[PDB]
Design a binder for these strands. Structure first.
Ligand SMILES: [Mg+2]
Lengths: 181, 205, 264, 124, 582, 283, 283
DNA sequence: ATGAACTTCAAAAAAAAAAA
């Protein structure tokens, strides 16, 4: 616990991907994945990419669907995104939420299709559940630092003279690539 | 100063721009506000002057396409036959309006002998409290009556309580200065509302 | 010219028809969008007065000048002539292309959008025609149909407020005879302006208030609140005028008002 | 939700059948086919068919009732119902057809509301 | 504010570098651009067409403004260097010559009087030598694709000389300046003041400019031209003294938004929405943004575009606004423009009608309900349709439910009628018919069209006493008991008794409830039989008699009552709980 | 050109069928949803009069602006090929064509017709105007699910065993519809609605359900036609004062009405003798 | 075609059976609920007349627009494979198709048919319009629960060997349904419905229940067919002023009926002979 | 000369859910 991935082993055993190390490894992996671009920035979405996987409900679905300790299709991408938007910054939070809530549903719009503005506003209960899972058993409270002052660095280490708006989408997809990869 | 309190179910202070497709000025035009105060009392000695509109019910709209007629009436052609001269003017009307027009007046050049400002003031005061008028006041369009009242200070809740919408340049009061008797050649003076803080003050020219 | 100010509460009703359809919305009776109460633009009332005076008079001094092609088929010396031979120009006023106030003759009779008393329930009756008009898109093999739309108000007691101003009658020459014609109109115009769209309509009361003053010794609001129209006690949904208590209140107007109950 | 004085013969017969099955289901609660399961179809439609036999069958349930005073409780409301039944109608009217089911479930509620019958009996 | 909110984003889009026509021009849809050499000699008649399925006529070249010809002697007006296949070739598709040659006698005159006033251009000297040819213009008709420009009435040809290759003759930095000089000298000596929109002196523009995208033809949005719409003898644009610099701005502000992504039909009412002046973009958020943040006028229009789209997406989110979106919901009259909407309000304030649509439409859903939380109108109306949502009546239905939904108006009776039709025709009440009937009946209550009844709720109302709603609940429990007794049924009492239990309860419920004791007997958990019989006792306690016939009001209740009680039964522990609290 | 003004109370009834089904509601009879009272549109009874005049008159001067293959412009333009082809100067050619149909089309004389469609052929008001007839009592539309033992198309389910297209045959078990009608002299002047064209309409109202029958509507009957003929081309009395005069109430104690025998049509011919004539044609 | 208009009262009873089950109501007989009186759709008797004609005629010009494998668009497209394949100019192609479908199919010639469906064959009203059959007295639908000692698919087969699917058999212990009907001449002209087709229809009405027997019908008979043959193509008398001549009441002292011997069918042919015949075809 | 009648103008416009 928490069971990020439940793999029914080829030997009819079951191995548990600990969400602790799942998020940790994904963040570390998409810290090298981004270079000077989002190294410590994409990880803060790597840390959070499957925060909703902490859902007490999802930790009843990933078991049910993948046959760990013996069908609902519980959303989990949105919870990490809502966590980001409330913790870092209205800018960095939504930046990071594009990556997070899209990490399985595909990169989302803010308004039109698969809108983030809808999912985040509807993620409040889901984020409450998933964050309760996160705090409930393990995962020291400084596991998700989401240090905006530090996260401001690789944003401004790459966005010299601010963030171009007309091509801020390219991170939203490149760092998205870092996360989804 | 008179704090008369125009109100009516519907109102159309039709924006000059959207006249053929009537879209009411969001609040009472200081011309329509004033001409109301000429409907209750006027004389070619009194010259009304709206000092401060105060919106009393929120700016709420209802579109009403009326089959209006297209052409003036004329001595030349002795009938319209509307179905020939039909037009369908939409009317974005102001539903459930109310306005306490804080208006006063002045004495014109042709004030006559009995130029008593108090005379016309008390005349209008009696007219408004009693309910008298020369003309049931038109909320922009005569199809809309001004269920008025002559308030003393304040007897209705103005809705734009906090600082509210600046309706931009509204028609203030069409300039009948170049006009001969009976307003032939006019012009339109217009005013920044100034805003609608809670009830718009107007600008004396 | 008349020498009294008349503020009247007309109360007509529509029993099974479209009192005044909305060009906004095809032809459905003008509802008040927020409260559902039906609207009947006074120009509709101003039309049926116009129509009635066009049907009945058929002479000079009582033409309409805004006449229907489908119902009958110096400067202040022709504008007086227009306010002489045209009953409408006197009654409802004019915008004479030549004039003093850039055209207007206001005319005594101001009129109110006839708001229904209670929420009308516009019944969208999709009617059919067993025939197409044009060589339609689908004026096709099987049959020519032009499935249509005709709305009704299953009942609406529409309340209009008119303000005959004796001050305007003096300019227009709107004499007491013309104003009597006007009452005859309101009362006897939904008996003559019948149609398919307009169903059955009836002037269920024309409560005029004659004022001893030219200026008018009342607030018109106070007078109209003397004509209290309510749904009756046990009437759940209104369907006829006998489902409304039209309780006039002549108790206090008696100072110098005259509640001429000219239609009810 | 029970009009004990309804007089609607369908409704009083529904009430009567509800108490009849209440007695049967208190006579032996472990019962494969209560009179709802075997008689209701016609009791709702042909009251003369069953309701004669339902009351051949009734005193024996009243006997089988373990609590001998509960038998008086339920028989009393059978009589209270049957005051309103001047006759078992040959065929229940269609209005009465439905009101029989109404009565069954109204009186069944009245019986399975905790104190209702024991109370209402004690005001007689 | 209708137009000063259009002038005040022309001044924003013209300053956001969004590419709006600059002070003398117009993004005219020029379909069949002409190519000429430096000295006449027609080169090619390129067509800058090929867009959305109706091949909209041309890439929008930002050419000198259309002069609003509109008259009997319309030939004299002659737009500068782009006009018409009747103005450029003297070719009249249907207008006949001397109504196209006089056009060409003035279009050539326009070009030449430009050439005399603008020499040494090689773009206009080229066309002025192409308009003094009479043969290369004949060669224009003998072009490869001329036969396709003759098909489009009112084709607008324009003169791109070769060796500029994107730049028209009316794009060179002399014609560009000439228009910026012919809209700064000729359109400045007019009636001196005073602006309606800006309030500045700004010489008044009679003949406001043909707002395109509303009507069947570009119509002058603000245009008082009939004998009496004129107020004070002001005559057609001095009735509304809008300066030329302000008239141009809002006219080309509508023109772009009715040609941009801003345009979207609310319902049957084409609407241009654009963000208002955004707040100063609070410093922290502007720290990351470079520049910093810019007020792109049409930036977050999606918030409102995807609000009305949410009514069909079913993706409605209750929005928190304070970002105000101008929403000018114009619509054609015949050749005037009817402002049907004007909303400076936030998208949250605009949502109050779709929110009320999706809150009157709220209906119970269990867990893992395949139904969306806010159910999309097309998929919602698809529960009214025969079998697939295209035959729902495009006048009292899909086109009027939307108006009854976009505006919080009363859903038409044609929902009870249609939703009930499908309830007893599909023999089941899909969420979407229950939800749509809940919306209808809630708004019928709220409109005083359904007097005695009280508004429905999301949940089953284990109350409500309604001789249609409680029998809907009764049918729901009866069919649940049957489907609980026989798991696999081919003819549930829905499929067999619904059409008459919904509309004619004595015909059926007197016989459903003889099936009922047998269904309860067959329940494998006799305690479950007791629970279901208990709740049917509770349901039927609210019923004093099955009605002979259920009013159209209550067959909607029956459907709503049915779905309420059936999703109460299919709730996690609802019946077990409600039974246990008795 | 009649010289009186008529205000009639037509009272027809529907035994078993759709008096006028609502295409908005499958074919459900038009119910006023608030009262459940049935509705039979103006156009339904106008069409049944039209059908009666397509049945019984069948000549020029009584054409009907007509049935299925009724491209209406084919008649409207047929007006413009008449005595008014070109000498009537479109301004009044429209009126001349309008008068041609008010000479030819009994429907266009009796009722109006929106004829402005093709070569604009006028726009007639129609001296005879019926009102939406509301059943006196709520019609208890029965909504019978009929069956068809033959599928129509090659259905998505026109499958192996049986071909079946069940469908709906809504019926009113009984509805006493009260049409009010207004035969205005003023529009009888512009359309030439004759006293003959009025007796044809009286016959039509009395007999137009005996002849316009269907599976949909089953049995409908004209249960009474009380005409108030006023002495003047104006109105002797307000119309509704004359229509409340014919009060139709469900019988003393019938909770649901099954036939006219369960209604009581009491007329009040006591005071109309002011100068008016109540001529009772069906009742 | 016929040159008289007929209004017939067709009293038919059901003794122990389901005259017309309401698919909306299980299969229990159609009932006028607020009066309990039974109903038998017009389409039900039209169906049994169709079954009768399909039974007896067995020849072209009297087909039936027919039984289960009766994809109607197939028959309609047969109409468009005729003399009017192309020669009838799509406008009147559907009218020639109507004339065909009327010629071939006695169903269509006699009752109407909505055949606008496939290769559109027009839209026949049908001269013969039976109404709904409202039983004189409330049918006391018995709803006889029956048993079957057999089940259907081995999914409802018992967890033991004892298969049974009791099911329900709704029977009217007696109901004298009364079907008013109208042979309209104006539409007989449309369909070519002749006096031969009409005599076929009268035979069909009398004998339509001797042949359409079910375990559901039990026993239905045609207790009377009183046909009012008007002199005119028009109606000599109003149809319901005729149908009130056939007054069917439960006899003096029967609480509720159980056979036709419990109903007195009083026929009042006293004064209808104004110009008009009453022929008691069935009773 | 003023105001209806008329003649030009311009050449539409189109959508709509999943679910991580
Ligand atoms: Mg994941």
């Amino acid at each position: 616990d928490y069971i990020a991935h439940a793999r029914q082993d080829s030997s009819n055993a079951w191995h548990s991907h600990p969400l602790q190390k799942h998020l940790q490894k994904v963040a570390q992996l998409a810290k090298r994945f981004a270079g000077r671009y989002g190294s410590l920035f994409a990880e803060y979405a790597g840390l959070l990419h499957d925060l909703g996987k902490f859902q007490e409900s999802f930790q009843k679905y990933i078991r049910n669907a993948s046959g760990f300790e013996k069908l609902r299709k519980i959303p989990h991408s949105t919870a990490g995104a809502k966590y980001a938007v409330e913790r870092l910054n209205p800018f960095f939070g939504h930046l990071l939420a594009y990556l997070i809530a899209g990490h399985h549903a595909g990169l989302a719009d803010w308004y039109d299709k698969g809108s983030l503005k809808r999912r985040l506003q509807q993620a409040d209960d889901e984020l409450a559940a998933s964050l309760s899972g996160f705090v409930e058993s393990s995962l020291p409270e400084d596991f998700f630092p989401l240090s905006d002052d530090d996260l401001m660095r690789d944003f401004f280490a790459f966005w010299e003279d601010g963030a171009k708006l007309e091509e801020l989408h390219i991170w939203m997809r490149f760092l998205f690539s870092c996360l989804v990869d | 100063r008179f704090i008369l309190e125009i109100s009516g179910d519907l109102a159309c202070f039709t924006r000059s721009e959207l006249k053929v497709e009537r879209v009411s000025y969001p609040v009472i035009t200081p011309s329509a506000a004033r001409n109301i105060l000429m409907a209750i009392l006027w004389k070619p000695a009194i010259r009304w002057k709206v000092l401060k509109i105060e919106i009393l019910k929120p700016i709420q709209w209802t579109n009403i396409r009326r089959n209006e007629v297209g052409t003036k009436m004329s001595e030349r052609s002795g009938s319209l036959y509307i179905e020939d001269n039909r037009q369908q003017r939409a009317s974005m009307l102001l539903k459930d309006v109310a306005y306490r027009i804080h208006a006063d007046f002045d004495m014109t050049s042709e004030a006559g002998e009995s130029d008593n400002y108090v005379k016309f003031a008390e005349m209008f005061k009696r007219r408004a409290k009693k309910g008298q008028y020369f003309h049931q006041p038109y909320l922009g369009c005569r199809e809309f009556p001004c269920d008025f009242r002559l308030l003393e200070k304040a007897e209705d809740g103005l809705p734009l309580e906090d600082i509210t919408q600046d309706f931009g340049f509204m028609l203030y009061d069409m300039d009948f200065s170049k006009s001969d008797p009976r307003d032939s050649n006019n012009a339109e003076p217009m005013f920044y509302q100034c805003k609608a803080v809670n009830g718009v003050i107007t600008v004396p020219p | 010219t008349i020498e009294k100010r008349y503020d009247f509460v007309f109360l007509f009703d529509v029993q099974d028809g479209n009192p005044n359809g909305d060009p906004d919305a095809g032809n459905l009776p003008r509802i008040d969008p927020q409260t559902g109460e039906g609207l009947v633009t006074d120009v509709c009332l101003k039309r049926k007065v116009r129509n009635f005076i066009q049907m009945t008079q058929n002479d000079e001094h009582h033409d309409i000048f805004i006449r229907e092609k489908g119902i009958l088929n110096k400067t202040e010396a022709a504008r007086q002539y227009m306010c002489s031979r045209y009953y409408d120009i006197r009654t409802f006023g004019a915008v004479m292309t030549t004039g003093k106030n850039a055209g207007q003759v206001r005319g005594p009779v101001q009129l109110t959008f006839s708001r229904s008393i209670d929420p009308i329930m516009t019944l969208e009756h999709s009617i059919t025609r067993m025939a197409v008009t044009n060589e339609k898109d689908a004026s096709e093999t099987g049959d020519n149909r032009t499935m249509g739309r005709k709305f009704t108000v299953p009942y609406g007691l529409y309340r209009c407020h008119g303000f005959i101003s004796t001050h305007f009658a003096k300019q227009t020459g709107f004499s007491e005879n013309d104003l009597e014609l006007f009452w005859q109109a309101l009362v006897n115009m939904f008996d003559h302006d019948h149609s398919a769209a307009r169903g059955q309509m009836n002037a269920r009361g024309l409560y005029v208030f004659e004022h001893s003053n030219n200026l008018g010794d009342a607030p018109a609001d106070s007078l109209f609140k003397r004509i209290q129209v309510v749904k009756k006690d046990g009437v759940e949904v209104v369907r006829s005028f006998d489902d409304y208590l039209v309780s006039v209140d002549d108790k206090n107007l008696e100072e110098t008002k005259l509640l001429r109950k000219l239609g009810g | 939700g029970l009009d004990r004085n309804r007089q609607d013969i369908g409704y009083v017969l529904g009430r009567l059948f509800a108490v009849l099955e209440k007695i049967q289901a208190e006579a032996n609660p472990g019962l494969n086919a209560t009179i709802a399961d075997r008689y209701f179809g016609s009791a709702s439609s042909t009251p003369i068919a069953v309701f004669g036999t339902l009351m051949r069958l009734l005193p024996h349930h009243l006997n089988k009732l373990e609590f001998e005073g509960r038998a008086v409780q339920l028989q009393w409301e059978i009589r209270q119902i049957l005051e309103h039944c001047q006759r078992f109608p040959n065929h229940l009217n269609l209005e009465q057809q439905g009101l029989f089911a109404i009565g069954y479930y109204h009186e069944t509620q009245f019986l399975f509301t905790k104190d209702a019958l024991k109370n209402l009996f004690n005001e007689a | 504010m209708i137009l000063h909110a259009l002038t005040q984003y022309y001044q924003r889009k013209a300053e956001s570098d969004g590419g709006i026509a600059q002070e003398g021009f117009e993004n005219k849809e020029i379909p069949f651009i002409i190519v000429i050499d430096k000295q006449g000699n027609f080169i090619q008649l390129e067509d800058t067409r090929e867009l959305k399925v109706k091949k909209k006529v041309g890439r929008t070249f930002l050419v000198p403004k259309g002069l609003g010809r509109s008259g009997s002697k319309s030939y004299e007006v002659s737009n500068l260097l782009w006009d018409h296949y009747g103005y450029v070739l003297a070719y009249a598709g249907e207008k006949g010559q001397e109504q196209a040659d006089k056009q060409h006698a003035s279009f050539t005159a326009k070009v030449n009087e430009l050439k005399q006033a603008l020499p040494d251009d090689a773009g206009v000297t080229a066309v002025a030598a192409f308009l003094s040819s009479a043969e290369e213009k004949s060669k224009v008709m003998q072009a490869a694709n001329w036969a396709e420009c003759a098909k489009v009435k009112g084709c607008n040809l324009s003169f791109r000389l070769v060796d500029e290759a994107v730049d028209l003759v009316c794009q060179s930095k002399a014609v560009r300046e000439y228009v910026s000089q012919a809209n700064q000298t000729q359109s400045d000596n007019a009636q001196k003041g005073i602006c309606l929109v800006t309030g500045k002196a700004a010489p008044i523009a009679r003949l406001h400019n043909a707002v395109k995208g509303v009507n069947a033809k570009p119509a002058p949005f603000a245009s008082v031209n009939l004998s009496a719409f004129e107020s004070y003898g002001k005559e057609q644009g001095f009735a509304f003294p809008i300066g030329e610099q302000a008239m141009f701005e809002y006219t080309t502000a509508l023109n772009t938004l009715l040609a941009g992504e801003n345009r979207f039909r609310i319902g049957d009412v084409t609407t241009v929405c654009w963000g208002a002046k955004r707040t100063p973009l609070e410093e922290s958020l502007a720290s990351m943004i470079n520049g910093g943040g810019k007020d792109n006028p049409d930036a977050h229009i999606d918030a409102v575009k995807a609000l009305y789209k949410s009514l069909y997406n079913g993706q409605y989110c209750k929005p928190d606004g304070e970002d105000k979106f101008y929403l000018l919901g114009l619509s054609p009259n015949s050749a005037r423009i009817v402002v049907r909407f004007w909303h400076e309000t936030t998208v949250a304030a605009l949502s109050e009608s779709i929110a009320a649509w999706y809150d009157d439409l709220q209906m119970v859903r269990g867990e893992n309900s395949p139904y969306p939380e806010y159910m999309p109108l097309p998929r919602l109306l698809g529960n009214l349709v025969l079998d697939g949502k295209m035959e729902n009546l495009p006048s009292d239905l899909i086109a009027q439910i939307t108006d009854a939904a976009l505006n919080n108006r009363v859903l038409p009776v044609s929902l009870l009628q249609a939703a009930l039709r499908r309830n007893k025709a599909e023999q089941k009440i899909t969420y979407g018919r229950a939800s749509l009937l809940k919306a209808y009946i809630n708004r019928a209550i709220r409109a005083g069209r359904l007097k005695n009844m009280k508004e429905l709720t999301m949940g089953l109302d284990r109350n409500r006493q309604d001789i249609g709603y409680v029998l809907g609940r009764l049918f729901a429990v009866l069919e649940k008991i049957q489907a609980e007794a026989n798991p696999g049924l081919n003819a549930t009492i829905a499929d067999r008794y619904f059409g008459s239990a919904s509309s004619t309860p004595i015909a059926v419920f007197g016989t459903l409830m003889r099936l009922l004791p047998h269904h309860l007997n067959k329940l494998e958990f006799e305690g479950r039989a007791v629970q279901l019989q208990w709740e049917i006792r509770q349901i039927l306690e609210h019923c004093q008699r099955f009605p002979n016939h259920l009013n159209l009001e209550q067959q909607g209740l029956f459907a709503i009552g049915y779905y309420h009680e059936t999703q109460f039964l299919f709730t996690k522990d609802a019946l077990k709980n409600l039974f246990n609290e008795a």
